[PDB]
Amino acid sequence: PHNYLAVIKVVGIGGGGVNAVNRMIEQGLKGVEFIAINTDAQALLMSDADVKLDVGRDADPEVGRKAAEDAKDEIEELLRGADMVFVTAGEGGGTGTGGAPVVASIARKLGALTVGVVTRPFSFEGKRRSNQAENGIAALRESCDTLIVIPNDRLLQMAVSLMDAFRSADEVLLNGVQGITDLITTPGLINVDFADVKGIMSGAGTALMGIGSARGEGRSLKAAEIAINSPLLEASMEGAQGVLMSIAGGSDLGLFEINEAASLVQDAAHPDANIIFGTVIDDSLGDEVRVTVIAAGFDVS
Amino acid sequence: HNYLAVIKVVGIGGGGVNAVNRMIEQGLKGVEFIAINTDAQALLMSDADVKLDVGRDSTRGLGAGADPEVGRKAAEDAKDEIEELLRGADMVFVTAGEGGGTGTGGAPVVASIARKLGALTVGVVTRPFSFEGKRRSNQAENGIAALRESCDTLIVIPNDRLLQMGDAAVSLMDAFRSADEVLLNGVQGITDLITTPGLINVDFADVKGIMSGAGTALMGIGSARGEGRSLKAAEIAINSPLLEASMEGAQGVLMSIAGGSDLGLFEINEAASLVQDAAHPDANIIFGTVIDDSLGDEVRVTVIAAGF
Ligand SMILES: Nc1nc2c(ncn2[C@@H]2O[C@H](COP(=O)(O)OP(=O)(O)OP(O)(O)=S)[C@@H](O)[C@H]2O)c(=O)[nH]1
């Protein structure tokens, strides 16, 4: 599936996934195609995504899986020609959890680089029966090139109130897509080869994410140090066999400070890691920079 | 506190969704608008930020047939989904016209979810006009009782009182537009204190303090222009037919006065002094101001009375 404009499709499925996609649209995530797949028969969350599919008209993960399988031909036509496909059921469970692995499985058989994004709920939300959430991860993992896992519990170490906890979760979920897609789609001083992104993420397994932000003097080293040490990475970093790092910032981000952060991440990473590094121009940020680190794979000693 | 409060306004059922459309058309700022209904077509014409169609198999997109139990089940069936839309709100408004199936039965579900999450939860609903018939009146009564259980504060506006206000409504359509406007005035009279304060700043913490667990409430509205406007608008508000002449009895009162950026303390204080004198001798009264540079020489007073 060769392209020089990388075709990136972002699929939100189920109520939480469509809601995640609506937030990306509302925040102006650029360069990707949004697809909203509703999986529930009794309700429909509307969306401004350019492409929409209501497979429900026909809160169990099993119900979502069969609804998605029932619509496999339509989903495939929707995904055909993508170089990369993100799939997420977003926050909360339900039918989207059963549908996401089917979308992933189809994207991968098509040859797209297939990236799942899945959240672990906060421990205080309790647990609905049969271990559903943890079976959704395992199903998603069997059919993704890379599954990015966001353990929401680790956000309470980044003092957090309940509303702040929920909002922090929504924002890091949006970053699990945007951090990577911006690096591919929006030019910075340091640009990356999509084939290198593919070499890092194809068949790579589960990955964790870290984020950091800083302003003013020494901002790049500071934000990179926060990101590399993020509790959301759960110390995945020293074993990771593949590391992707993106620095978003204004047009005036200097080569020297860019290179300082690049050097820090190479020191932090396993000696044998592939490291993909680049920058993103976002003039809306003033003097803030924002760093995303994706750490994929594991040390096998 | 420098805290940025997140406010979500839910309209559920046809009347609630039309009220939310009116809030959007009048430029109410600082809040996210959510529309919930049992009719995919009506929702298509909503301008809300989030639109959720519920009860699709039970109603097949034609509303609850005036049956509140149908509306309750459609909302409850979509509880996890509604909760994920509300997650993160500091304050939630639930607005509807009581008396039909979708709003009557579904509003208490929305409010219970928001309350369980700990958001300050404010209902703003109408009673149907008496000419709509006794079944709608009874259904609304029951829906209001259920909603009151789920809200921190529930503001109830009787549509019958609207007919004693303003000019004689030409037509059913204009009367319901008047209902839309008063539901907007009830939401905006509170949220603009938080989102666009004037000289006397009443913030989210202050509003939570007086509206948490306050119970059933009434509203009055008044506006005037030119010389003596603040005293005039405040007197209209506290005599409002909507307040059912209950200002004297209220032990909790929130008042907001909106005016241009040149609304000054003398004027503000003249209106507050008027309202203090008409209030219960033990009333807790919070006075706040709103900047609204679109108003001209006009000021708008809103009074929320609770604690009877
Ligand atoms: N504010 C406002 N209220 C309305 C409007 N139309 C009707 N109402 C009031 O709202 C009440 C409930 O009507 P409506 O909201 O349309 O029903 P519903 O909740 O959607 O219930 P349904 O599914 O059985 S049709 C009516 O009895 C009437 O008093 C409107 O356009 N704006």
From Swiss-Prot, chain A:
Claim: Methyltransferase is one of the keywords in the record: no
Molecular function (Gene Ontology), one example: GTPase activity
GO cellular component terms attached to this protein's record: cell division site; cytoplasm
Subcellular compartments: Cytoplasm
UniProt keyword annotation of GTP-binding present: yes
Binding residues for GTP: 15-19, 94-96, 125, 129, 170
Subunit structure of this chain's protein: Homodimer. Polymerizes to form a dynamic ring structure in a strictly GTP-dependent manner. Interacts directly with several other division proteins.
Family membership: Belongs to the FtsZ family.
Function, in words: Essential cell division protein that forms a contractile ring structure (Z ring) at the future cell division site. The regulation of the ring assembly controls the timing and the location of cell division. One of the functions of the FtsZ ring is to recruit other cell division proteins to the septum to produce a new cell wall between the dividing cells.
Protein name: Cell division protein FtsZ
Residues of the full protein shown: 4 to 315 of 379
